[PDB]
Nucleic acid binder design. Sequence first.
DNA 1: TCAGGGTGGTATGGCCGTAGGCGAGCACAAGGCTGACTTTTCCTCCCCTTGTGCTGCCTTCTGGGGGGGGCCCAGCTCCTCCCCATGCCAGGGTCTTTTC
DNA 2: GAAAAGACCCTGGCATGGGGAGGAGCTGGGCCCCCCCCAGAAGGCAGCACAAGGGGAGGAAAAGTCAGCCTTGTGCTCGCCTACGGCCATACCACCCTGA
Lengths: 93, 92, 93, 103, 89, 88, 78, 78
Amino acid sequence: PGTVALREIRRYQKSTELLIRKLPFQRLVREIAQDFKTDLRFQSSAVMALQEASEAYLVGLFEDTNLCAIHAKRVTIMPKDIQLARRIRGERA
Amino acid sequence: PGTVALREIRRYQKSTELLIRKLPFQRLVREIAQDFKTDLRFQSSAVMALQEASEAYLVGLFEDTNLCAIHAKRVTIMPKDIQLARRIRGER
Amino acid sequence: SSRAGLQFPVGRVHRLLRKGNYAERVGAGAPVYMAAVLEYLTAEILELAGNAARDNKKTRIIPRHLQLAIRNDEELNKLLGKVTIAQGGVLPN
Amino acid sequence: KSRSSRAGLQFPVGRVHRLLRKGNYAERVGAGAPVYMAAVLEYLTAEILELAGNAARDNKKTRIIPRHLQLAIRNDEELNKLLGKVTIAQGGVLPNIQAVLLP
Amino acid sequence: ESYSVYVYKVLKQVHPDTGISSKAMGIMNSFVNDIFERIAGEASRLAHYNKRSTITSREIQTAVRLLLPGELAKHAVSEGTKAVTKYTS
Amino acid sequence: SYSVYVYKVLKQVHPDTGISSKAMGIMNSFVNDIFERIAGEASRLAHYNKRSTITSREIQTAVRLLLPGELAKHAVSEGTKAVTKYTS
Amino acid sequence: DNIQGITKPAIRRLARRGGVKRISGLIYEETRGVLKVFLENVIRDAVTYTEHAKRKTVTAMDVVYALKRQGRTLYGFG
Amino acid sequence: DNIQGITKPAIRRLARRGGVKRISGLIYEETRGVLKVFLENVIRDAVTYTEHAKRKTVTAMDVVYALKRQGRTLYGFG
DNA sequence: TCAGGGTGGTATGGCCGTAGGCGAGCACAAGGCTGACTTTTCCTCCCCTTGTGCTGCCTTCTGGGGGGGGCCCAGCTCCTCCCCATGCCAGGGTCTTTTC
DNA sequence: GAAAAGACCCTGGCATGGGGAGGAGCTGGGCCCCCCCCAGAAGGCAGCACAAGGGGAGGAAAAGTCAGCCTTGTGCTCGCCTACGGCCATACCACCCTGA
């Protein structure tokens, strides 16, 4: 139960596509922006710029969470690894 | 062995002095700047600014190192911890 | 400053704006706004740094009080998150 | 006369001049600032593009795509440090796994 | 740029007993000379974003709420619109 | 938009390899970013010494502050070569 | 409600891109909260820029500016 | 060779200020080489400004700007 | 030593007309993706032991901190002026948009 | 990516205020030395508690399977928003003197 994970890593590191479905992500963008301004409109490139950055922030956060996991002599990443990574990069202490 | 370390923690956390000796710090600074430009003078305030920046940087690093030890179920901070903190920070 | 009720110098901030090359034209409300915002922020950071001084049984403000007040907050700490306050020490934690 | 040939350059020293002046960076702008900041960017572009073209030829391809620019930037140590806050769109990540993770 | 004369006035209105040491005055000079460049570096590029040439209370308002956290920007903007209103009037 | 000059540089270094329309919308952002970087640093360098002009000394110091290591060394060399060729 | 459109396969795919081999079952909600905070922080700045330019539509550059305002300059969107 | 002037007691006091309880035996040598690169960066970004201003005395303002350009602002020295 | 009252002007900006691109909304398949389930293997987590490196303490000896003083190169100021960068206009060369 | 037409400012020429490079004067503060002496560092030893290895158990990810659903690629429409244009209104800059 660790070989499919190793080929999944080798598959999703070689590719550059967007791993979050565009329609639900655009719905999330539109549902968040509403609390700031009602009747707001977006371009296609506004959504595709929010997503293309939200999918690099999360990948970087995961490459730091994995480092915390390896530090703790572990392979299963846990929420406390994310918390440590965020605290140390200063995102939210 | 460790209660004297907790009282030490309290003492050096309640205090704002410079924990590195000023003359050795100055000689280190003037040794470092010699590589860049020889016969380079320094102010007193310039060296004090460097020592205030460095002693806050190192103190801030030793707080991330302690987190990287509490993560690994340890109390002894180690170079492994310093490198983990300095890599997650972005410096390494 | 007298017309706008500002203890910060509206004329001086106007001179700083014009000489600072921010734009080629500074309006007549720009330095009035940006001498009430700085004045308010200074008042905000002095309130807490004086309350800390009252907490250390001292009639004087010191960088220790300033760092203590700035860090023991939520929004001032977020704003001044990459600032080194000389002779400030660190919060007892 | 072409001041971007008087220097030996290919970036427009004239357009860099007008951008330096319009951007409000100083009340005056010298006569060598546009030529210096049209050879810094030309050299930096000629470096990143050469590295990305090499990365594309390593993938048996003949057209640079954002993946190759990201590969070149994140593979070179200097460009890593220069572009350390840059999110290259449609770039992916560097193919790399931990050694504590393999069987 | 010394604001030492003015930082001392505003303290006399809030704390009429507490003083500032010369080391803590040299810090508040660095503070005000820092949020001054912070605000009018955001209110500067905002004009260039709009291809505009004038920095006014519309751009200062935007820069303030673009750099100040949460309830701070809700108050920093509040004081300014209470200032420019009196200045023009 | 620097697309034509990025094309010229690309054709000069790698004359067989081409560039995509989205690998070109990154070079434009790259050049626009590393312009607004050196130009802001040279602006600070002029303002601190209380100058009104920006020249190829404030550009050179900004290069030396921004670019790391051999990048800065070679960029300074190229800038000096271009300015000393324009002047001549 | 739309935060669950970031499905468990999507977060796991992102983690596999980040090199994560094994994923605990609580990582998914943590990543959803994290993404929500990131999006809330960037969109606020983008809409503030849009309101300043008096527009009604959030342009791509209005987001690029909100992203370079956070030290996360984004290349590729003009 | 004045890097040994950052003595083990000083590195331990700096550690106690951060909250460290127990210190390994390689922490001192590993902190010396961290402070060395930090100073090597700042005392290069300050001498750059010094040389530009055609001065030979490094000023607190050169240091403060060299620190500001690395994301670490310092309040107190001008 | 610098900000404020008064004059003139002109350029930057405010307001209405407009038309067209793009952004939102609606069906419609229908296959790829997702969600639920099951088995089971591997990973996490706890417990035990030890032996080793870390701490605490004691003594000695050093070298950094606190002054005092000399001097001597360096940074700041003042005045000259000259050489560099700017405001403005003519014309076309180059950069911008479309088509294959 | 190359060919073809257009339109927008690039480059040259002319007149000009001004910005900074230079020489001189000055003074100040940074380096260098001298003395003391006492607190701090360095070394050594006892002892102790903590990190790391070993082992075992169980439970929670992971892999394979199957059924449902819903994103999306497509087509179509409506309209509103926004960039451009035209006209003109007044806000602030350059300048002249003064008083805080």
